[PDB]
């Protein structure tokens, strides 16, 4: 099954507890640290040993993280270990932010221009995108030298392309169809 399918219950549990106790930022930091630690080659290997018990694996992950996990996050790590799901922590961390973003009414937009970075350009597009989405927008601009001129805006599954390369694609299919 899709890692997202297996991680959905755990991510939703973390979010519904975090929201009801005013901890939406503490859990964000804890899940991000747990994901990183588990991905390390030495920790990866330790977590796949037949000699260690579920509690021993869980404990080892809490000691490396330390202060970064609050009491509740420590209990969540044990629950994930007891169920043998410690290979899903990066996915649980990703899905938690998505639930939180819909709650805070925000989107992490991924703008890709043809050789340009400017505050005048960003604030001119961010008001229209914020108005259209009805959410706060966290632009993450980048460079795409591939484009002749223009910009491609990615937000969720929505993709607004206003690049000349897109006009060339349209012109090419029109002639052969």
């Amino acid at each position: 099954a899709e890692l997202t399918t297996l991680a959905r219950p755990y991510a939703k549990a973390a979010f519904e507890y975090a929201q009801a106790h005013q901890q939406l930022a503490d859990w964000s930091a804890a899940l991000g640290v747990l994901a990183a630690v588990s991905q390390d080659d030495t920790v990866r290997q330790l977590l796949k040993e037949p000699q260690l018990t579920s509690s021993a694996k869980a404990q080892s992950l809490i000691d490396v993280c330390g202060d970064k996990l609050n009491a509740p996050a420590q209990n969540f790590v044990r629950t994930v270990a007891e169920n043998k799901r410690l290979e899903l922590l990066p996915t649980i961390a990703e899905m938690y932010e998505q639930l939180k973003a819909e709650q805070e009414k925000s989107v992490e937009v991924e703008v890709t221009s043809a050789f340009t970075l400017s505050k005048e350009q960003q604030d001119k597009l961010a008001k229209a995108l914020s108005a259209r989405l009805s959410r706060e927008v966290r632009l993450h601009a980048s460079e795409d030298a591939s484009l002749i001129g223009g910009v491609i805006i990615r937000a969720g599954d929505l993709v607004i392309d206003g690049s000349v390369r897109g006009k060339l694609a349209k012109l090419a299919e029109a002639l052969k169809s």
Partner: protein
Amino acid sequence: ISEIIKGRIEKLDVASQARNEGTIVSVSDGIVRIYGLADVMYGEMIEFPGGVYGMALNLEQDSVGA
């Protein structure tokens, strides 16, 4: 992440296991599942304690079925 989290790991006692050795995980109906035999070739012979020998048939991702 932090220099602190980068530390502690050298005191976790993970060590290592030779690529030519592994450990038995389960025993059922003449089939044995082994963890750690990274250098096994399909059809190769595996040596167990007591002079018992096996033949590697399933070289799956994280387990060898002998």
